[PDB]
A paper describes a structure:
As an example, the [name] protein PatA and the [name] protein [name] are required in Gram-negative bacteria for peptidoglycan O-acetylation. Finally, we report the structure of [name], finding that it has structural features that shape its activity as an O-acetyltransferase and distinguish it from other [name] esterases and hydrolases. The overall structure of [name] reveals a central fold that is typical of the Rossman-like [name] hydrolase family. Taken together, our results support a model for peptidoglycan acylation in which a tyrosine-containing peptide at the [name]’s C-terminus shuttles an acyl group from the [name] active site to the [name] active site, where it is transferred to peptidoglycan.
With [name] [name] (CjPatB), these involved two engineered truncations of the enzyme lacking its N-terminal 31 (CjPatBΔ31) and 113 (CjPatBΔ113) residues. All three forms of the enzyme were active as O-acetylesterases and had similar kinetic parameters when rates of activity were measured with p-nitrophenyl acetate (pNP-Ac) as donor substrate. Repeated efforts to crystallize full-length CjPatB or CjPatBΔ31 were unsuccessful, but we were able to crystallize both CjPatBΔ113 and a truncated form of N. gonorrhoeae [name] we had previously characterized (herein named NgPatBΔ100). The native structures of NgPatBΔ100 and CjPatBΔ113 contained electron density consistent with sulfate and chloride ions in their respective oxyanion holes, while the selenomethionine variant of NgPatBΔ100 apparently contained an empty oxyanion hole. The corresponding homologous residues in CjPatB are Ser138-His310-Asp307. In [name], this is formed in part by the sidechain Nδ2 atom of Asn196 in NgPatB and Asn200 in CjPatB of the block III, a conserved sequence feature of almost all families in the [name] hydrolase superfamily. However, we observed that the highly conserved signature Gly residue of typical [name] hydrolases in the block II sequence motif is replaced with Ser161 in NgPatB and Asn165 in CjPatB. Structurally, this results in a type I β-turn of the peptide backbone at this location, in contrast to the typical type II β-turn found in most other enzymes of this family. Leu250/Ile304 (NgPatB) and Leu254/Val309 (CjPatB) form hydrophobic patches behind the catalytic Ser from which a water molecule would need to approach the acetyl-enzyme intermediate for hydrolysis. This altered geometry and increased hydrophobicity appear to be characteristics that delineates these O-acetyltransferases from the true hydrolases/esterases in the family.
Author numbering: 115 to 328
């Protein structure tokens, strides 16, 4: 249900910059997170890109894109990651076929997650990795939880930071388009496709990252 609750708070160092990577979920969170980090005099490079994921690595390789971004800017010391909504499907590699959630599939996906973390560590950067919050479609939601377990396990092993989102975007342990705001009033945080964020939802995601910074 919940692997662990991450209470880590990072102290930010002068001149250090942020890099965002991920899919259209990160694009939506990025709008809010950029504004919040801008307000703290922090520079942001936002590479988030629609229709990407670790499972689509042959179409767009986030490990290559991330490595190149660090190469172009030695001042990036914080990597923020939110992806996976496009990823929970069988993977074919040549004649080899890997059914989603099978042991070999998990090996491949875990390796792709680890590659991202190792690239940040090689460039002396720390990693904030968002848990994908629940989604409305039951079948997709079940698969997303497999992804989130992998992210959390890899982040734990590499001693980076995992941003818990499941509780904050759930009501009575299930998906909800609405949550309570800071004053206990109901606010719409998910768009009607049951996946993406409203502006208020994006700000709530951004707040969860900011709660891992001091
Ligand atoms: Cl997307």
């Amino acid at each position: 249900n919940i692997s662990f609750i991450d209470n880590t708070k990072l102290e930010l160092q002068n001149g250090d910059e942020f890099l965002f990577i991920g899919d259209s979920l990160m694009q939506g969170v990025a709008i809010a997170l950029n504004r919040d980090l801008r307000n703290l005099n922090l520079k942001v490079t936002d590479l988030s890109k629609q229709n990407t994921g670790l499972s689509y690595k042959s179409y767009f390789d986030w490990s290559k894109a991330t490595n190149e971004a660090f190469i172009k800017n030695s001042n990036i010391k914080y990597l923020v990651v939110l992806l996976g909504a496009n990823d929970p499907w069988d993977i074919k590699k040549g004649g080899n076929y890997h059914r989603f959630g099978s042991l070999s599939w998990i090996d491949i996906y875990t390796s792709r997650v680890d590659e991202i973390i190792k690239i940040a560590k090689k460039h002396k950067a720390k990693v904030f990795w968002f848990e994908i919050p629940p989604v409305k479609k039951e079948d997709l939601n079940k698969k997303i939880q497999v992804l989130n377990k992998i992210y959390s396990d890899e982040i734990l092993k590499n001693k980076e930071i995992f941003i818990n989102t499941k509780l904050f975007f759930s009501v009575n342990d299930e998906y909800s388009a609405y949550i309570k705001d800071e004053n206990n009033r109901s606010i719409k945080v998910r768009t009607d496709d049951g996946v993406h964020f409203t502006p208020s939802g994006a700000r709530e995601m951004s707040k969860l990252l900011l709660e891992h910074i001091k």
